[PDB]
Amino acid sequence: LLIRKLPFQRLVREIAQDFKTDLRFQSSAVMALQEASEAYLVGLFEDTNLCAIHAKRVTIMPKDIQLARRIRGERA
Amino acid sequence: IQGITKPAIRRLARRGGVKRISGLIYEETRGVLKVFLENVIRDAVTYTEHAKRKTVTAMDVVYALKRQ
């Protein structure tokens, strides 16, 4: 993995608390969560970057991300 | 909160193939990363409430993933 372990656990925890108030997570279940989030974000960036490329650019802009999301189906 | 450190991001982006990054990608990546979790756990819980189970196993995530 590539995200730091501790600061990821805390985030999952805040959201998890939010829905539902009674809430408990397994140890590997959070591990599985992290490994997904990275895979996804790398998945995402490869797309994002190739919209940077499409624009004949090198630096990626949010506009690139946003496109890559509109085209898949991600809201917002 | 958003302790998703900027150089964490760069590691991934670069893993993606990214070669240069606008400064606003950080806030953006953060925003999406949240949303991804926000509604991948939202939908995992539901696979665990519907086995009337205490806590959420990895397995029920993998299930909540496949919907995505």
């Binding site: 591990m31 599985a32 490994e35 | 993933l65």
Partner: peptide
């Protein structure tokens, strides 16, 4: 038959696969 293999115990390899990842 020697045609069944052997493990490593990592399930993550499936998530890597859900999104496509080295």
């Amino acid at each position: 038959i020697e045609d069944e293999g052997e493990p490593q115990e990592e399930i993550s390899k499936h998530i890597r696969e859900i999104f496509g990842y080295d």
